[model samples]
Target: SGAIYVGNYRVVNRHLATHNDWANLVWEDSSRDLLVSSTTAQGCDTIARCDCQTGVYYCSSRRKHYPVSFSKPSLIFVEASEYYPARYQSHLMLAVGHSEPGDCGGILRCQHGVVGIVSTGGNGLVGFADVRDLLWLDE
Candidate 1:
């Protein structure tokens, strides 16, 4: 339905633009590393890494909203293999699912099974979730 995007950052010393994809992001995680607790935006699903030291966003994942689940969940990022054409298909809006440790897998971890990547279809909300409160986790 929409496109995903990554923002520019200072830690990303090398600048590259005029394109929007995984290439748009992926800067060196210097000064501070956001490898942990990094996440995508709720509204846009734009991957954003938090700098543990700078308290800001850093090298993020390219924007790529996958197909919305038609069942109980509404939004889901397409797993690397689920999609027909693995490379850049704009029409699909896949929800981010469980990871298995590989390039196709993301850094997101379900610390608590309660954290949901897609919201229940009954409501329109989507993105990561946290279990402890049964509340929608902040993006």
Candidate 2:
């Protein structure tokens, strides 16, 4: 599968490029922080905060004495309306799953319980369903 583009934002391939074992995308309510969970055994669900104000990412794990630098695509932009369906001031907790080796590469949208195929065995569909909408979620 090629790069997955949701509207104007290019979804980063977290599996191949970064650690995809397990992670959580969290938005702290009171602090208005957007943090991505880190895979560090040194802390309990350590997080790397995304600084929209400074245009940088940094981790706050105590394992490192100093702030560790985190990286993300400098070009891609995830529109609030496209990806974030909720209100701007509202908090969110997204539970990201694991992508086993050899499985088709894609971004798993747990909100709808669908895997948006972006690479292997894919046909350029990015949403809660496949290109043909064959995948379904039953409640």
lDDT of 1 at 37: 23
Candidate 1: clashing residue pairs, number: 15
Report the lDDT tens digits of candidate 1 across residue range 78-122.
Answer: 223322222232211223232221212222222222112221111
How accurate locally is residue 114 in candidate 2, as Cα lDDT from 0 to 100? 24
Q: Which one is best on TM-score? A: 2
lDDT of 1 at 88: 30
Minimal lDDT window, size 10, model 1? 51-60
Candidate 2 on 1-139: residue-level lDDT in tens?
Answer: 2223322222233333334422442211211212223333332211122222111111122111111121221222222432243333212121122222233333333222222322211122112112212111110
> lDDT of each prediction vs. the true structure?
0.23, 0.24
C-alpha TM-score for every candidate: 0.16, 0.18
Identify the runs in model 2 with alpha carbons over 4 angstroms from their true place: 1-3, 14-99, 110-139
Best by lDDT: 2
